[PDB]
Amino acid sequence: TVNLGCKLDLKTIALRARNAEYNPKRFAAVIMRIREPRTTALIFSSGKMVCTGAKSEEQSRLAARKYARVVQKLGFPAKFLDFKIQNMVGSCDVKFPIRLEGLVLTHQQFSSYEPELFPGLIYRMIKPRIVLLIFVSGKVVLTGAKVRAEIYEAFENIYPILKGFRK
DNA sequence: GAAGGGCGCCTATAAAAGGGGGTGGGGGCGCGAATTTTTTTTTTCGCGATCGAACACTCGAGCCGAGCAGACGTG
């Protein structure tokens, strides 16, 4: 997220902008999307904006600055204030099938495998407090992170266990 | 045209931000919400209660008759 520091007129924005859309009857924020690092932003009337989609923190800082740029170019007193990363998402694969019934058995306290509902196992780490999604093919997705190290650490913890249930 | 293959959305997690929306916590006014029910019968009482209509005798105040006082007319 980032705060622009001033109030704006989203309808004018919607009118001016070329890569945006606005619908008060649907949602309050105006939606913008740029090809740079290919991203999307949520701009509030309050002066707050949210930026998602970047594949690195520098490019997200880059994209947000680019958004602040087009807002300036509209004639508005944009300010790059209070920039902060709120979440990071990662994934990887291990290339082998795995034992999930066992994993949920041996980690009952954390796991919440629901094969009926969502196909993969939901694992809630409490180290760098991270949420993982593990699938039978071996693919793994991670979220809840604030820095890359938490992903490597959370994965560094889970990888031996997973190899240990290899089929 | 029915049976089937293909395409694409669905649910899940996260996370924040703005505002509209749902439950309950608490409060309070209403007047219907009427549930109107035929009951369920159990009288067999059975007296002794209470209770208001029904009615008769006595007293008090006013009027009329007799007694008495005042006024009018004749001897």
Swiss-Prot record:
sequence repeats span which residues? 1-71, 85-162
On tissue specificity, the annotation reads: Widely expressed, with levels highest in the testis and ovary.
Q: Cellular location of this protein?
A: Nucleus
Which residues participate in DNA binding?
R33, K48, N87, R124
* Top-level taxon in the UniProt lineage: Eukaryota
Subunit structure, interactors included:
Binds DNA as monomer. Component of the TFIID basal transcription factor complex, composed of TATA-box-binding protein TBP, and a number of TBP-associated factors (TAFs), including TAF1, TAF2, TAF3, TAF4, TAF5, TAF6, TAF7, TAF8, TAF9, TAF10, TAF11, TAF12 and TAF13. Part of a TFIID-containing RNA polymerase II pre-initiation complex that is composed of TBP and at least GTF2A1, GTF2A2, GTF2E1, GTF2E2, GTF2F1, GTF2H2, GTF2H3, GTF2H4, GTF2H5, GTF2B, TCEA1, ERCC2, ERCC3, TAF1, TAF2, TAF3, TAF4, TAF5, TAF6, TAF7, TAF8, TAF9, TAF10, TAF11, TAF12 and TAF13. (Microbial infection) Interacts with HIV-1 Tat.
The family classification in the record reads: Belongs to the TBP family.
Q: What does this protein do?
A: The TFIID basal transcription factor complex plays a major role in the initiation of RNA polymerase II (Pol II)-dependent transcription. TFIID recognizes and binds promoters with or without a TATA box via its subunit TBP, a TATA-box-binding protein, and promotes assembly of the pre-initiation complex (PIC). The TFIID complex consists of TBP and TBP-associated factors (TAFs), including TAF1, TAF2, TAF3, TAF4, TAF5, TAF6, TAF7, TAF8, TAF9, TAF10, TAF11, TAF12 and TAF13. The TFIID complex structure can be divided into 3 modules TFIID-A, TFIID-B, and TFIID-C.
Q: What clinical condition is it connected to?
A: Spinocerebellar ataxia 17: Spinocerebellar ataxia is a clinically and genetically heterogeneous group of cerebellar disorders. Patients show progressive incoordination of gait and often poor coordination of hands, speech and eye movements, due to degeneration of the cerebellum with variable involvement of the brainstem and spinal cord. SCA17 is an autosomal dominant cerebellar ataxia (ADCA) characterized by widespread cerebral and cerebellar atrophy, dementia and extrapyramidal signs. The molecular defect in SCA17 is the expansion of a CAG repeat in the coding region of TBP.
Q: What is this protein called?
A: TATA-box-binding protein
- Full-protein residues shown here are 171 to 337 of 339
